[PDB]
């Protein structure tokens, strides 16, 4: 069932900070490209920084030797690695360019010296790590430059782990090759031989869901996102924590930008009755979706919520609509996106055809067309969908596969 755009103009006024959210997330996604190539809301309500608990603080020289030997032997201890990464945060000091507050927590004032430690509370007990030496002929102490190279390599294991699925081998290999180059090039120093990172990754394939490791990756990424630093290229491994588990929100802001409309204008094109709940879910106030350098941007990795209201599933109707329009527009990214089967994909593909025709007038005009055609796709819409999907190598559970199955299987 579809709703007249006029009726949803009243609910349009209630929404707040919608334009600021679209602009901020889109600007951040763009900035991140340089490094790339029930539901619980994340807002902190008790002024406590994100926190984790690790073992007893280690001698940084010994921890470096142990962790490096593990890297070379493809035998890394995750508890040790987390302990070392937290203890290494002291090496990454910078000056905060502006006052930094998030969810009521004053992280730093303009001019303060800051490290990644300023952003989070790392608690430590008295349990010593293992710190085994596996395979390491270094008697001297590591330099800071070497520490930073190891921190970079280790954190890159988070990005490699997150890449999962079939036919990802070549892609991961190229990322790994690039990462190795970055962390052997000044100001970093070569501390491992080529192909060491991939060999170790094969034995650390699921580390991206180790909560403490994920937490540390998000902490470093939040730090370098705000604080320019000699070693900021570490983000090549951590950039993927930004907006983690928010693919529905990110698709929404990206789609508004693609159709070159304001958020206010674009929302009127979401006629279907199931959109309203989802758009309100994304624009819930108090979550700092429009605040630069908020904890929000890394809330999943930092443990603020394990049930994201911004995922593709949490807003599956909006998500399905956007990518059916993308398919209509021949966008490979949408054709390869995964359909949210529970959120009326057939109905979403109908509205997607009409919105796709429109974006190739106004919300009311599109609405009238649907009513005049009894809620059915036009033959031209189907011909367009099929001409795109039938010439595409459809992946399992993808929008392309749905369209072939739905419109080109008889």
From Swiss-Prot:
Q: What does this protein do?
A: Encapsidates the genome in a ratio of one protein N per nine ribonucleotides, protecting it from nucleases. If expressed without protein P it binds non-specifically RNA and therefore can bind it's own mRNA. Interaction with protein P abolishes any non-specific RNA binding, and prevents phosphorylation. The soluble N-P complex encapsidates specifically the genomic RNA, with protein N protecting the genome like a pearl necklace. The encapsidated genomic RNA is termed the nucleocapsid (NC) and serves as template for viral transcription and replication.
Q: How is it modified after translation?
A: Phosphorylated by host CK2. Unphosphorylated protein N seems to have a better affinity for leader viral promoter encapsidation. Phosphorylation of protein N in ribonucleocapsid may stabilize the interaction with protein P, thereby playing an important role in viral transcription/replication.
Miscellaneous notes:
Displays a superantigen activity in human and mouse, activating mostly V-beta-8 subtypes of T-cell receptor.
Q: What is this protein called?
A: Nucleoprotein
The impact of changing residue 138 to L is: In strain: RC-HL
Compartments where found? Virion; Host cytoplasm
List the GO terms this entry assigns under cellular component, sorted alphabetically: helical viral capsid; host cell cytoplasm; ribonucleoprotein complex; viral nucleocapsid
Pfam families per the UniProt record, alphabetical: Rhabdo_ncap (PF00945)
Origin organism of this chain?
Answer: Rabies virus (strain Nishigahara RCEH) (RABV)
MF annotations from Gene Ontology: RNA binding
The alphabetized UniProt keywords are: Capsid protein, Helical capsid protein, Host cytoplasm, Phosphoprotein, Ribonucleoprotein, RNA-binding, Superantigen, Viral nucleoprotein, Virion
Tell me which family the UniProt entry assigns to this protein: Belongs to the lyssavirus nucleocapsid protein family.
InterPro entries (UniProt xref): Rhabdo_ncapsid, Rhabdovirus_ncapsid_C, Rhabdovirus_ncapsid_N, Rhabdovirus_nucleoprotein-like
The annotated subunit structure for this chain is: Homomultimerizes to form the nucleocapsid. Binds to viral genomic RNA. In nucleocapsid, binds protein P and thereby positions the polymerase on the template. Protein P acts as a chaperone on free protein N to prevent it from aggregation before encapsidating genomic RNA.
């Amino acid at each position: 069932i579809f709703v007249n755009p006029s009726a949803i103009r009243a609910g349009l006024a209630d929404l707040e900070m919608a334009e600021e959210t679209v602009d901020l997330i889109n600007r951040n996604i763009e900035d991140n490209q340089a490094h790339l190539q029930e539901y619980k809301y994340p807002a902190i309500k008790d002024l406590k920084k994100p926190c984790i608990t690790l073992g007893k603080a280690p001698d940084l020289n010994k921890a470096y030797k142990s962790v490096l030997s593990g890297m070379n032997a493809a035998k890394l201890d995750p508890d040790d690695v987390c302990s070392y990464l937290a203890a290494a945060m002291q090496f990454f000091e910078g000056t905060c360019p502006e006052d930094w507050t998030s969810y009521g927590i004053l992280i730093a004032r303009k001019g303060d010296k800051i490290t990644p430690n300023s952003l989070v509370e790392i608690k430590r007990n008295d349990v010593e790590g293992n710190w085994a030496l596996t395979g390491m002929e270094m008697t001297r102490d590591p330099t800071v430059s070497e520490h930073a190279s190891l921190v970079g390599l280790l954190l890159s294991l988070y990005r490699l782990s997150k890449i999962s699925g079939q036919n990802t081998g070549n892609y991961k290999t190229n990322i790994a090759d690039r990462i190795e180059q970055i962390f052997e090039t000044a100001p970093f120093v070569k501390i491992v031989e080529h192909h060491t990172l991939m060999t170790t990754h094969k034995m650390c394939a699921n580390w991206s869901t180790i909560p403490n490791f994920r937490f540390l990756a998000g902490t470093y990424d939040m730090f370098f996102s705000r604080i320019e630093h000699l070693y900021s290229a570490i983000r090549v491994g951590t950039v993927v924590t930004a907006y983690e588990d928010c693919s529905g929100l990110v698709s929404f802001t990206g789609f508004i930008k693609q159709i070159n409309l304001t958020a206010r204008e674009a929302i009127l094109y979401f006629f279907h009755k199931n959109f309203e709940e989802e758009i309100r879910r994304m624009l819930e106030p108090g979550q700092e979706t429009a605040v630069p350098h908020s904890y929000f941007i890394h809330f999943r990795s930092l443990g603020l919520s394990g049930k994201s209201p911004y995922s593709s599933n949490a807003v599956g109707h909006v998500f399905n609509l956007i990518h059916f329009v993308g398919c209509y527009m021949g966008q490979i990214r949408s054709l390869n996106a995964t359909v949210i089967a529970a959120c009326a994909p057939h109905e979403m593909s109908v509205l997607g055809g009409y919105l796709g025709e429109e974006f190739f007038r106004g919300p009311e005009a599109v609405y009238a067309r649907i009513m005049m055609n009894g809620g059915r796709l036009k033959r031209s819409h189907i011909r367009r969908y099929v001409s795109v999907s039938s010439n595409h190598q459809a992946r399992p559970n993808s929008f392309a596969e749905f369209l072939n199955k739905t419109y080109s299987s008889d």
